[PDB]
C-alpha cells in the first residue's frame, strides 16, 4: 500500500543504468517486497574481479598477524663456551661448542626470530574497490537483501532463525546497521545469542566477513552510506595531507 522507494543521491554515469533490489522487512515472516531500491552501478554492478577479492581478503588475514614464535640460536643457549675436546688426537669429530646446531640440545641454525610483523598496506583505492567487488558478487548471486530497518517484532533469537529459514537465506547471515548506538534493541538481543547471525555497524564492513557469511543483509541508510564512502574514492584529488586534517569539502 505504501511502497518504499530509494533513489540514487550521487550522480550516475549516463552510459549505465542503476540496478534494482527488493526492499524487505524483518517485522514478519511474509513481509517481503516493501519496495524497490536503486543501487549505484559502480558499487553493486562493477566487474567481477575475483583476483582483487583474493588480495584484499589475504590482506586482512595477514596484515594484523604478529607471529611470536622464536627459538634460541647457538649464542643464546646457556653454556657452550668451552671447547669439548682438543682439536687433534682424540680421534673424534672436531667441535668448538656443545650448543652448535649439530649437537643435541644446541641452537637452531635458521629458526623463527619472533616477534614478527606481517603488516603491509594495500593502496586505499584497492581496498575500497575490494568492497565494491564483494558487494557486486553478493548481489549477482542473490545473496544480498536490502531492508528498511532492523526492528524485529520480538527479541527472541528463535524468531530470527525461523525467519531466515523460511526465506531460505542460508546457514549464516550477516546483518549490517548504519551505526552502533542506533541499533534497535530487538535485533541486538536476537543476534547476541546466535552464532551464525552477526550484527555489525556500517563501519565494520569487510570482505572477509562478507565472504564468510552466505547471506548479506543491508539497510537503506547503509546502502546510501556505502555509496557515499565508496564512490568518493573514484573521483578525488591525490591527498596533499591525510584526510583526517580539515579540508574544504570533507567530510561530506
Amino acid at each position: 500500500p505504501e511502497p518504499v522507494l530509494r533513489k540514487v543521491e550521487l550522480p550516475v554515469p549516463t552510459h549505465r543504468r542503476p540496478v534494482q533490489a527488493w526492499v524487505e522487512s524483518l517485522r514478519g515472516f511474509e513481509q517481503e517486497r516493501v519496495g524497490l531500491a536503486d543501487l549505484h552501478p559502480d558499487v553493486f554492478a562493477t566487474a567481477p574481479r575475483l583476483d582483487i577479492l583474493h588480495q584484499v581478503a589475504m590482506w586482512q588475514k595477514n596484515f594484523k598477524r604478529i607471529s611470536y614464535a622464536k627459538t634460541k640460536t647457538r649464542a643464546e643457549v646457556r653454556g657452550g663456551g668451552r671447547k669439548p675436546w682438543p682439536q687433534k688426537g682424540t680421534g673424534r669429530a672436531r667441535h668448538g661448542s656443545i650448543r652448535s646446531p649439530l649437537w643435541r640440545g644446541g641452537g637452531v641454525a635458521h629458526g623463527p626470530r619472533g616477534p614478527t610483523s606481517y603488516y603491509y598496506m594495500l593502496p586505499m583505492k584497492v581496498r575500497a574497490l575490494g568492497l565494491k567487488v564483494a558487494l557486486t558478487v553478493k548481489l549477482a548471486q542473490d545473496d544480498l537483501h536490502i531492508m528498511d530497518s532492523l526492528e524485529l517484532p520480538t527479541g527472541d533469537p528463535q524468531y530470527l532463525t525461523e525467519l531466515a529459514h523460511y526465506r531460505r537465506w542460508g546457514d549464516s547471515v550477516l546483518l549490517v546497521d548504519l551505526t552502533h548506538e542506533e541499533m534497535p534493541q530487538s535485533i541486538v538481543e536476537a543476534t547476541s545469542r546466535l552464532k551464525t547471525f552477526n550484527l555489525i555497524p556500517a563501519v565494520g564492513l569487510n570482505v572477509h566477513s562478507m565472504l564468510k557469511h552466505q547471506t548479506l543483509v543491508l539497510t537503506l541508510p547503509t546502502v546510501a552510506f556505502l555509496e557515499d564512502k565508496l564512490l568518493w574514492q573514484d573521483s578525488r584529488y591525490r591527498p596533499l595531507y591525510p584526510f583526517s586534517l580539515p579540508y574544504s569539502d570533507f567530510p561530506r
Binding site: 554515469p13 549516463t14 552510459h15 566487474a47 574481479r49 583476483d51 568518493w232 573514484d234 573521483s235 578525488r236 584529488y237 591527498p239 596533499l240 584526510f243 580539515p246 579540508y247 574544504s248 569539502d249 570533507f250
Partner: protein, 134 residues
C-alpha cells in the same frame, strides 16, 4: 604569568577558508568553444551507441598511456574499457593497420578491461577516441 592581551575576531576568517584544499576533483566548467586551448574536449552527450565504452579518467582525460618494459618494449595501454572489448580490438586493428602496414600485435585483458598494443600510438589513439565521442 602576565600574558599579553589579545583580540578574537571572525571577519578575517574568510581569508582562511580560501586556503583549504578540496578533496573532490571539480567538474570542468563549460566553455563557449571546443576544444579548449589546452586541447581538452568534454565527452559527447549522448554517449555513442557502440558495443563497448571507454570512460574518461577521474581527471577527465582519455585513458591512453604509453608503457615500456625491458627498456625496448614499447606498448600503448587503453584502460577503463567497458562492454565488448573484443569489438574495440577489431576497430583498433582496422585503424592502426594502414599506419603500420601490418596487423598490430595486441593483447586483450577481459578481466581488467584493458587493451595493450605493441608500439607507441598514444597521440594517434587519443585523437581517434575523441572522434567517437568517448
Amino acid at each position: 604569568p602576565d600574558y599579553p592581551r589579545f583580540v578574537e575576531s571572525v571577519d578575517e576568517y574568510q581569508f582562511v577558508e580560501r586556503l583549504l584544499p578540496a578533496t573532490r576533483i571539480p567538474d570542468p566548467p563549460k566553455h563557449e568553444h571546443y576544444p579548449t586551448p589546452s586541447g581538452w574536449q568534454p565527452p559527447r552527450d549522448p554517449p555513442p551507441n557502440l558495443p563497448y565504452f571507454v570512460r574518461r579518467s577521474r581527471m577527465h582525460n582519455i585513458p591512453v598511456y604509453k608503457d615500456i618494459t625491458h627498456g625496448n618494449r614499447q606498448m600503448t595501454v587503453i584502460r577503463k574499457v567497458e562492454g565488448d572489448i573484443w569489438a574495440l580490438q577489431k576497430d583498433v586493428e582496422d585503424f592502426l593497420s594502414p599506419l603500420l602496414g601490418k596487423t598490430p600485435v595486441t593483447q586483450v585483458n577481459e578481466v581488467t578491461g584493458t587493451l595493450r598494443i605493441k608500439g607507441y600510438f598514444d597521440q594517434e589513439l587519443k585523437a581517434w577516441l575523441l572522434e567517437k565521442g568517448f
